[PDB]
From a paper:
We serendipitously discovered that the [name] variant of [name], affecting the lysine residue that binds [name] at the active site, is able to bind [name] covalently. This observation led us to recognize that a number of lysine residues, located at the entrance of the active site, can replace Lys36 in its [name] binding role.
The pyridoxal 5′‐phosphate ([name]) homeostasis protein (PLPHP) is a ubiquitous member of the COG0325 family with apparently no catalytic activity. Although the actual cellular role of this protein is unknown, it has been observed that mutations of the PLPHP encoding gene affect the activity of [name]‐dependent enzymes, B6 vitamers and amino acid levels. Here we report a detailed characterization of the [name] ortholog of PLPHP ([name]) with respect to its [name] binding and transfer properties, stability, and structure.
Author numbering: 3 to 227
Amino acid sequence: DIAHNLAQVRDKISAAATRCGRSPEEITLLAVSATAPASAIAEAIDAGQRQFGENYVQEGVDKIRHFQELGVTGLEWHFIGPLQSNKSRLVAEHFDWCHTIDRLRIATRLNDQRPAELPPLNVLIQINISDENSKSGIQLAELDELAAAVAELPRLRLRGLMAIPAPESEYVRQFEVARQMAVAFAGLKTRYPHIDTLSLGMSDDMEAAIAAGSTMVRIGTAIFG
């Protein structure tokens, strides 16, 4: 049952925040609805969930159009998969957030393809903080330069950072890696305006991510099976 699962995930988020002295409202639950059908998303919507993350552009755009045409208002769609230049226009035209900025060219394409009537597309710069098998995300040493370039794009809004750490079973390493991100996030927040989003943590490392300073957790399986 999707509604029961949302309540259970929101409980674990709330607990983890309270345990480390944070208000549960500091943590956004991003429901990863990739691979789940629109009908299941509609259950989640009926249970109050409003922010959904999609990994593939056409799947995501199809859901977005479906709920727009039902007249369901008030949703926030996050594109959280790797973005190819030949699918940027679809992201720029339909999504509210994109978590995977790791190249200036893709950010500029998104900016150019974003209709002017829409709010600026909220973007996070993706850091490859610890995963040698992934080619997604930049190194931290590239962050200052990329952030400065991205920040000038008027149809984008740089809101913070995202990372997908390498899989890790030890809580200690989960926390230390998440802290590296939180430190980078804090440093960015001092110089840049409206830095408020650290997209960090999934089901298996949710507690360490929240203890370290994440503002947004991405949960898929635990919600949609």
